[PDB]
Design a protein around this nucleic acid. Structure first.
Ligand code: MG
Ligand code: MG
Ligand code: MG
Ligand code: MG
Ligand code: MG
Ligand code: MG
Length: 191
RNA sequence: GGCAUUGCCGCGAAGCUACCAUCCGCUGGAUUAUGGCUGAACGCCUCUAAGUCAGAAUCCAUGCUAGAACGCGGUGAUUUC
């Protein structure tokens, strides 16, 4: 309907500095620095009061104003990643064969190694994206935690780990073995 | 020794040749379907709309064959009369 103006607000907490050149967004917080290239969306950023960034689409269509809120959510996720962090908890699920998950090194690349999935002899190797920390959770059986500033990076690593453990040539409603994302939250608690 | 239109028979080197013999037949990317991530649209949801991951005997490359006889480069020597 070609809305004249549509805008969204990006709240910036105190310990966060957001540098926005043309469409290269850099967010700096306690936990590190994130960078995103948004040159494919054609939006306009403006700083209001050093705690608020407005992002606007002028004379935008339906898809354009949808992508505006997408941009706002992406920048909010960058800020949340540099303030709270992002942690995805996955639980290994298996009926008979225990799934052995470990961190191995190959040329200093820190792969996640999956052995014995459904009794397989094949060894699954999922590379760990830079910035993603892998921890094996004590006091919870068969739980892997992936943490990082970039929600995209941690979620993609969890997705890769889940997808590498897909069951083939079997009724997946019966053979439920795999490594599934069980929780998606932040690193810092109750903030 | 000749002839029998290579007279016939056995063996027969060379050459040619047989899954009737032996050897050899490569690995990278991008993708389809599909399964996903982030994520609005549509306070939720959503693989999709922006962006994005993986992925087929597929495609393009690597590799192999020919080398444009009007595509090109480097290089040697260039007629004592
Ligand atoms: Mg069957
Ligand atoms: Mg005679
Ligand atoms: Mg004779
Ligand atoms: Mg999701
Ligand atoms: Mg798309
Ligand atoms: Mg020629």
């Amino acid at each position: 309907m070609k809305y004249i103006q549509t805008e969204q607000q990006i709240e910036v907490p105190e310990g966060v500095t957001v540098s926005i050149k043309s469409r290269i967004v850099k967010v700096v917080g306690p936990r590190g620095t994130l960078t995103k290239n948004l040159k494919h969306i054609d939006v306009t950023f403006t700083k209001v009061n050093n705690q608020l960034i407005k992002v606007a689409v002028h004379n935008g269509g339906r898809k354009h104003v949808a992508a505006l809120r997408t941009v706002k959510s992406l920048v909010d996720n960058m800020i949340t990643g540099v303030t709270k962090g992002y942690k995805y908890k996955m639980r290994y699920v298996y009926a008979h064969f225990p799934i052995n998950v470990n961190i191995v090194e190959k040329d200093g690349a820190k792969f996640i190694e999956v052995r014995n999935f459904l009794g397989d002899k094949k060894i699954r190797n999922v590379p760990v994206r830079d910035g993603v920390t892998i921890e094996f959770s004590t006091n919870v059986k068969d739980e892997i935690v992936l943490s990082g500033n970039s929600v995209e990076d941690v979620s993609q690593n969890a997705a890769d780990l889940q997808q590498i453990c897909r069951v083939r040539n079997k009724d997946i409603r019966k053979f439920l073995d795999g490594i599934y994302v069980s929780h998606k939250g932040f690193i810092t608690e109750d903030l």
